[PDB]
Design a protein around this ligand. Structure first.
Ligand SMILES: [C][C]N([C][C])[C][C]OC1=[C][C]=C([N+5](=O)=O)[C]=[C]1
Ligand SMILES: [Mn+2]
Ligand SMILES: [Mn+2]
Lengths: 137, 137
């Protein structure tokens, strides 16, 4: 039986700007680096950056909706979003729902999100106003 | 302050075969499904499947090393991997060894992994046989 997410690995085109982004801008802990990768943590999350000559810097129009959302408290949300804006980090989507989300891109065009709230909160909101075709189990 | 992964969203080309893969084959818990997505959980992980007509199925040889690893116990690893092979799930290959892992593809070509072990265990293993140029912090 699977017990959760073990690690998330992102392919990166250049290690130094990606380490700067995840460690310095986003505040993750850097545990180790080598010639072709790095290991970081963010709370319980184990993040691996893997240098990959196949990775292209991808504009958001040319990638699909696959994305990775990080947890943040509502109290910290606005100041963290403002930090990303000061650093010139690009936004790939406006939040058009109820709930706090900020959609931003990493240096290689991986699609990231800051989100406040849990699965249980989302399910409760959907029970009140379900999406088209929605069935609960 | 970021505190971990809030959710992982995968773009899928066909909802029904993807829900079947994650729920019926991988054993994740299905909480809700609607015409254009589904919510599942795997332990603490909130997984969203999002129907996206922009999702393309790319051979693993021409997609980058971005991948998602799920935790499994030492006792369950071999039998779970055998069940995936018996079900005809395709494999892919990483450029480096990272311990006890099985690498497999989902129906849309997302790169998945079963892995036994924590970040702390990986760091201890790397201290005994480091990658090229490795530094520990
Ligand atoms: C083609 C998209 N949809 C049109 C109505 C099909 C929906 O079809 C199902 C929904 C839910 C379950 N179910 O909950 O197992 C099974 C089938
Ligand atoms: Mn999201
Ligand atoms: Mn891996």
């Amino acid at each position: 039986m699977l017990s959760g997410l073990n690690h998330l690995t992102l392919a990166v085109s250049q290690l130094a700007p990606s380490v700067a982004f995840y460690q310095q801008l986003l505040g993750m802990t850097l545990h180790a680096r080598w010639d072709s990768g790095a290991y970081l943590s963010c709370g319980d999350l184990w993040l691996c950056l893997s240098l990959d000559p196949q990775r292209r810097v991808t504009p958001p129009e040319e990638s699909d909706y696959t994305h990775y959302a990080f947890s943040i408290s509502e109290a910290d949300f606005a100041s963290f979003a403002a930090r990303l804006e000061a650093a010139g980090v690009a936004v790939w989507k406006l939040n058009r729902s109820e709930g706090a989300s900020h959609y931003f891109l990493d240096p290689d065009g991986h699609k990231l999100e800051l989100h406040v709230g849990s699965l249980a909160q989302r399910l409760a909101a959907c029970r009140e106003q379900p999406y088209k075709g929605m069935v609960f189990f």
